[PDB]
Subunit: 137 residues, 2 copies
């Protein structure tokens, strides 16, 4: 289920985090504009950058804590507030998160590993609603 | 589902509030001690007492407000704090609330009417968690 999925991802986190984030950037290549130096590179070239695995791992470390502090796939408002107030996310709107979760759910459905993909879709929807409640445009 | 149940109960709030509150007292008769004016009264005598219909409808109106503001049956912590800080609830513990929700779910499963009874049991569990976080014993 969703709670065990968090342990699945945590057990091989840099591999899942890069694979999911690459699925997001390949599904929505225009989203590369929020990052620096990601355009113009294939997946293997991104994975050998200095910063790419380390930053994607940090993103998923935090995503999994948000998911673990949730009840029934509903994140805490304080975790939504932190994501809205991070200076690194000052340019974003909730649509950027919904695209990330659409790609994440598609990855889980396609994978050989069992995941509770419907609960990740619901968690993404609930996080978008919480980000909007916390004031993201 | 749970959102429709809020509308079903709302639509005839006096009748459902009285029926569920009496199901509570009749399953857990020791709970009637907290309502000193209802001691020794039949159900029709209760229904002749203005405060009984008025105050039970108010209880259920507030429950429905808390249920409608929940996300995926997870209530707001602010709503749990209201219920804990009410002077009328000074002497209670989370087990009183657990009893009410066991009776409410039993009533739903026995009724003709369709209800998403599993969701009301999970809402009751999540609400007792939030009452305890908000300082109920
Ligand atoms: C629940 C979803 C997300 C979480 C948990 C999250 C978390 C974080 C974290 C922890 C960092 C710090 C990375 C570091 O400095 O090492 C970061 C940076 C950043 N985030 Fe997010 N983020 C999320 C979603 C998004 C989305 C959807 C976008 C844009 C489409 C985005 C754009 C950015 C950018 C531009 C940075 C700084 C640039 C960089 O790391 O290269 N984030 N994020
Ligand atoms: C989610 C569940 C509950 C809600 C929403 C709730 C709500 C309320 C409200 C709105 C009132 C004020 C009624 C008025 O003055 O008109 C009230 C009074 C009161 N509540 Fe609750 N209550 C809940 C659970 C409980 C439980 C489980 C108990 C005890 C076993 C309890 C014991 C009482 C008592 C003793 C009063 C004062 C009686 C009166 O003056 O009518 N409540 N409640």
């Amino acid at each position: 289920g969703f709670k065990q999925d968090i342990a699945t991802i945590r057990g091989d986190l840099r591999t899942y985090a890069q694979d999911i984030f690459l699925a997001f950037l390949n599904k929505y290549p225009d989203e590369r504009r929020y990052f620096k130096n990601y355009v113009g590179k294939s997946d293997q070239e991104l994975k050998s950058m200095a910063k790419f695995g380390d930053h994607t791992e940090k993103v998923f470390n935090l995503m999994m804590e948000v998911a673990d502090r949730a009840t029934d796939c509903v994140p805490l408002a304080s975790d939504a507030n932190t994501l809205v107030q991070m200076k690194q996310h000052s340019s974003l709107t909730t649509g950027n998160f919904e695209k990330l979760f659409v790609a994440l759910v598609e990855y889980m459905r396609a994978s050989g590993q069992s995941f509770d993909s419907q609960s990740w879709d619901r968690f993404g929807k609930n996080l978008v609603s919480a980000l909007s409640s916390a004031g993201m445009k």
